[PDB]
Amino acid sequence: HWGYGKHNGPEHWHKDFPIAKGERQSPVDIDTHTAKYDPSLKPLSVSYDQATSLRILNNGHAFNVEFDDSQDKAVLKGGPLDGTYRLIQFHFHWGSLDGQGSEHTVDKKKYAAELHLVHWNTKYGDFGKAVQQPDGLAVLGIFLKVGSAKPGLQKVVDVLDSIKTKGKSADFTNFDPRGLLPESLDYWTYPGSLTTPPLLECVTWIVLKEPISVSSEQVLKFRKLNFNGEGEPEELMVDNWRPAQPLKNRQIKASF
Numbered sequence: 568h569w570g571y572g573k574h575n576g577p578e579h580w581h582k583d584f585p586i587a588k589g590e591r592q593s594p595v596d597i598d599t600h601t602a603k604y605d606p607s608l609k610p611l612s613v614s615y616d617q618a619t620s621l622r623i624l625n626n627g628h629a630f631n632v633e634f635d636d637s638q639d640k641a642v643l644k645g646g647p648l649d650g651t652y653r654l655i656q657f658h659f660h661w662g663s664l665d666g667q668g669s670e671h672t673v674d675k676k677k678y679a680a681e682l683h684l685v686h687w688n689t690k691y692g693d694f695g696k697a698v699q700q701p702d703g704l705a706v707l708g709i710f711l712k713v714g715s716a717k718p719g720l721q722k723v724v725d726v727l728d729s730i731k732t733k734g735k736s737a738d739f740t741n742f743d744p745r746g747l748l749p750e751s752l753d754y755w756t757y758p759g760s761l762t763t764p765p766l767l768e769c770v771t772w773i774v775l776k777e778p779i780s781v782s783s784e785q786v787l788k789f790r791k792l793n794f795n796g797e798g799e800p801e802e803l804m805v806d807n808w809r810p811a812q813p814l815k816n817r818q819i820k821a822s823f
């Protein structure tokens with residue numbers, strides 16, 4: 568099955584998912600001199616005051632914090648978006664070392680981790696219909712650099728113990744995602760896809776310019792997770808990041 572090892576790594580995904588070599592693949596390298604400032608681009612609108620987290624799950628390639636998306640409780644709008652996108656879940660991508668982990672790179676600079684807050688267009692009614700459309704999903708990408716601790720992240724850090732291996736889940740209520748956002752909402756945007764199989768090209772990527780810093784110990788716990796299910800040989804969940812894909816004449820626009 569797909570994963571991130573040498574035998575089932577990102578380099579083999581095309582076999583089972585041909586779209587892997589498509590025209591609007593993610594992630595990509597954001598070249599700052601080449602991105603275009605677009606003044607017609609509106610400020611993002613992040614309204615997460617009413618978000619309802621439900622649980623955290625180790626799905627074998629990461630850990631997802633999932634939200635109640637049966638109503639417009641946590642939404643994202645504005646930016647290069649048209650309509651309302653409801654928050655479904657958030658997960659991360661991290662490395663074995665602080666020197667790598669992010670999916671997107673800036674001027675070829677690799678961050679320690681990358682957070683993805685996944686949202687779906689409500690005119691499609693359900694997440695499942697949404698992935699089938701060109702403007703079905705909106706993902707907020709936030710880079711993580713090692714420095715000072717991120718208070719807002721500790722709640723997550725603390726429950727990882729609980730969902731060590733694939734298939735485990737834990738009750739994860741009352742978690743406010745506002746605690747993971749940077750001060751500034753300046754962004755870069757381009758049309759791309761999911762960074763994991765099925766790699767569908769349904770995403771409008773919104774990657775924040777300003778990184779959030781987390782401490783060395785915060786990041787360390789992410790690395791204690793396992794790709795394997797319980798009672799199986801242990802394989803640390805590290806380097807669950809897909810490398811940069813060809814931009815292929817897509818244009819990266821900047822809000823600043």
Ligand SMILES: [Zn+2]
Pocket residue numbers: 658659660683762
């Ligand atoms: Zn992701």
